Amino acid sequence: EEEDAGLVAEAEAVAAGWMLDFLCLSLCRAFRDGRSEDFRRTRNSAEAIIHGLSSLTACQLRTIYICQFLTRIAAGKTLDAQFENDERITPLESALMIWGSIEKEHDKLHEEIQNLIKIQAIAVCMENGNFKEAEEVFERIFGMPFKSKLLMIISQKDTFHSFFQHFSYNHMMEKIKSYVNYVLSEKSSTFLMKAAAKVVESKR
Amino acid sequence: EEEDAGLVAEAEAVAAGWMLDFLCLSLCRAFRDGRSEDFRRTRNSAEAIIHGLSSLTACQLRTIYICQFLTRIAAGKTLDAQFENDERITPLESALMIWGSIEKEHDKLHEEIQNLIKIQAIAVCMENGNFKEAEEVFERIFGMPFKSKLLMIISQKDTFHSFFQHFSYNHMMEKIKSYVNYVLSEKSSTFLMKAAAKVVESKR
């Protein structure tokens, strides 16, 4: 009876791991395609499945971080959303923290996405007339040429500055979609998606 | 591109169907075992997965009704919970509506569970001192010997009546657990649980 219950709990953990990978793939695809409602509904399913998982492998933790990162990026302009216990941290600042924690290569694309999130974390505050909040985000992030140009823009209250058009919110999303395309290629061969694709193809 | 997107959406629907069956099995098992927190977390996952499913087969609708029925039964004493658009309907009355909609055999066990939910829908109101609400639940449900004994109990305000001890909340739960054991046997061979069990056994 206890041995049966134990084997059942272990099978539930295996199935939850398969569901996590499938939901991550689905969330990546909705983000890449710009399918906002599908992204919201998939995010809800991913959060619930994660609360039913206890011990995680390093691979499963990386998968959860990717889901959390995309969720904060999708909420990047929602300055009312609180993703951290410290209520001062904005959504893009929370995405930056996760981006620096993921066990992944720090290639040129990694640093380009990092620097675009830093610029946009300030830009989104400026565009909402939150000038003092922009200076506070700047202080939490930045602690030289890059840094001093941003402080000058904040002090002038230059919301529609040409600098934010060169390193725009759209450019940040496009670079992040390039990374998401690599995660999609990597996770497309996971168990639940492979098995479902084989079923669909067998009916063609 | 559109054909690829279509094949991907069809594979997501297949995987969601597999996840629905697995979560139903998991919810049944937590209900049978009395694992309250596991039941709550599994219910959350089942609700989210159901919102991402559109067209349902008759089998998938029956699976969703079983999940909804157990959720209302687990909330049977939570008179503040609103499961229907009509706010007057209590949780056990909502479970009774689903029990009468499921495409299942109307064997002796079916009618015994039906009559136990009817008695307890009134009993739970009486035990909370909600005497007028007990009469209103009685009117919605009952429209002769069974019916007249219940109306007499409501009018006397006989909360701890011996009748409610003979056909008790515990007796209703035990009969429902007998039914849940049949659903567990039927769904134990579904895809995701079979595959996860095979993985666990291969590591023994």
Ligand SMILES: COCC(=O)Nc1c(C)cc(C)cc1C
């Ligand atoms: C607020 O911190 C917890 C958190 O980020 N939760 C969360 C997880 C785990 C997964 C997804 C897909 C989305 C969210 C919001």
Ligand SMILES: COCC(=O)Nc1c(C)cc(C)cc1C
């Ligand atoms: C309130 O009506 C909708 C409803 O019952 N939703 C629901 C579903 C679909 C599945 C589960 C397991 C639980 C609930 C509460």
Ligand SMILES: [Ca+2]
């Ligand atoms: Ca805010």
Ligand SMILES: [Ca+2]
């Ligand atoms: Ca109420």
